[PDB]
Design a protein around this ligand. Structure first.
Ligand SMILES: CC1=CC(=O)CC(C)(C)[C@@]1(O)/C=C/C(C)=C\C(=O)O
Ligand SMILES: CC1=CC(=O)CC(C)(C)[C@@]1(O)/C=C/C(C)=C\C(=O)O
Lengths: 174, 180, 175, 176
């Protein structure tokens, strides 16, 4: 399910080059994750695109606040409860292309400020012999740790798990 | 749907729920119960669940686990759990409270480790279902914890619920894969 | 990160990062980029860096490195690196991917051995800086590996320490 | 050069070397001694080195370390060291063998955890140098491990040197 076929990988190469390839600052790193979803890509995109409702697919979110709300440069506050004194994160919508199904955001303030976290998600339609399905790609770039508590392992784990929830939610909707 | 019991499942499980997963709460404490359907034999699921020395086999977030040398699994034995960074705690020392191989019940209590969970105690029970010719499992897990001094700090329950739910999902994925 | 690169250094390195240190990732992999400033001439640093047969000069945890007898360095050649960071010493077979003496770029892939499954590939570049008559060096080293048991924090740590050893060595030599 | 003693340093240190860093080795065991010059006051260096509960302050490769709650630092106390992945161990439990604040000497033995370093015992001594009206520190650290051997010795030597290098860096940053 996170393991793409060679057919899928060839089809995704141009999108990876375009949206998921970062020019790194020294002291940073990037990861790319994939998730196959047995649902139509318009349905998956309808969930993914909702900047105000990350809790639908992401774990560890208490709440998300944005009022009479969606545009590039919009911000959200995500209260997360993966920290037990609940933490707030301020995130900005960097990209939103409904025709090409691309969105992304950056963490611009709050507890994980020093991470310079930036992420992009793309949604992709596959069709083989009357069967239609979806692949989601999600990549991020983050600063590497300077100063004991590196959370990049946790960042990868959570993306993986989040994408797994997205597949579950979307497949149950379909 | 994997985490939501059918009426037939919850009818059959009433007595188990009353015996192991029903709590009369003190002030400053919270509990919750989670269910997880697994398409695998209960004896296989139980063989994973009972391994007190290997929680990493079915739990996320565990870097490693150590137990005493010449480990004999008996109630009262402890394990030292090492978690990955990014979480409210990086270690947990846990005590085996119950190990009943006949009835398929375990449970543990968090004794120590630096974290925000105080007096956490959980119980896991494993249940056989058979219909027509098919066999499947339901796992129930409940916990009680002390909630912090923020009054109804729903943060603690929200955090533990997520972890427990994710760990039950992994248990299902692991047992199912093993069944194949 | 030697300590941190200046805005001027970063600006000057943009083009090299784009050319040599940006990877088109496979799903399930990650890439990381480290820098080290070195107060020594670039030709000196490169003379150490380019020696595929002698990684032990700048890298940690190497028991030995062996190559072909009468070694002639060119792309496609391999080395066996016995590493001691595992206590039942492990061996790594690594392939020289790039060598450009004119532009000071080299890189290798792990093709066999204990961490063969990681699909590790790394690139090192050496850069000359001159401002107001002092001359110095920045080294960039990047890698890509599959994500898994997760030894990638060790991989970043060891790259950082290795670059620190390169700086210490080259700076001593320049004296 | 910082890991390399001068003849004047080693001559003064002959006494300390003989007392703490010289070994009568049972077969199947090996020992090694390392040195690190630190341009910082020995009291600062000792204040870091003596902190049995905080080895991450000067050691590489440590994810975390815990000591029993309400810990008081005395010979016989233990710590549980958690190490990042990629190395021969996940964990190490270590016992404080020596803690002499007057003479600036500690040491510890590994008594458990899963790795390949059985009966590892090390001793660390911190030394003052003055000559003349200019002050620096030399740290000596030696260990005895029994092997399953160049490999065991090469590994431990690597860690010890790296850790001494960090100690020097961290101390020198604090002195600034
Ligand atoms: C993953 C993690 C993070 C923490 O902050 C607390 C603790 C370390 C105990 C924990 O292991 C939590 C474990 C829980 C809730 C349940 C379990 O294990 O059945
Ligand atoms: C870094 C590491 C890797 C291991 O495999 C063993 C162990 C966990 C003991 C260790 O902490 C080793 C520590 C050593 C040699 C010395 C020290 O700490 O003074």
């Amino acid at each position: 399910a996170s393991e793409l076929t060679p057919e899928e990988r060839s089809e995704l190469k141009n999108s990876i080059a375009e949206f998921h390839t970062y020019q790194l600052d020294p002291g940073s790193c990037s990861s790319l994750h994939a998730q196959r979803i047995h649902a139509p890509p318009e349905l998956v995109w309808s969930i993914v695109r909702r900047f105000d409702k990350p809790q639908t697919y992401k774990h560890f979110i208490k709440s998300c606040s944005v009022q009479n709300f969606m545009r590039v440069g919009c911000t959200r506050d995500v209260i997360v409860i993966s920290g037990l004194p609940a933490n707030t994160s301020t995130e900005r919508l960097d990209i939103l292309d409904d025709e090409r199904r691309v969105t992304g955001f950056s963490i611009i303030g709050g507890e994980h400020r020093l991470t310079n976290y930036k992420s992009v998600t793309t949604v992709h339609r596959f069709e083989k012999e009357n069967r239609i399905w979806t692949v989601v790609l999600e990549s991020y770039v983050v600063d590497m740790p300077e100063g004991e508590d590196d959370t990049r392992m946790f960042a990868d784990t959570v993306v993986k798990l989040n994408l797994q929830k997205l597949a579950t939610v979307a497949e149950a909707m379909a």
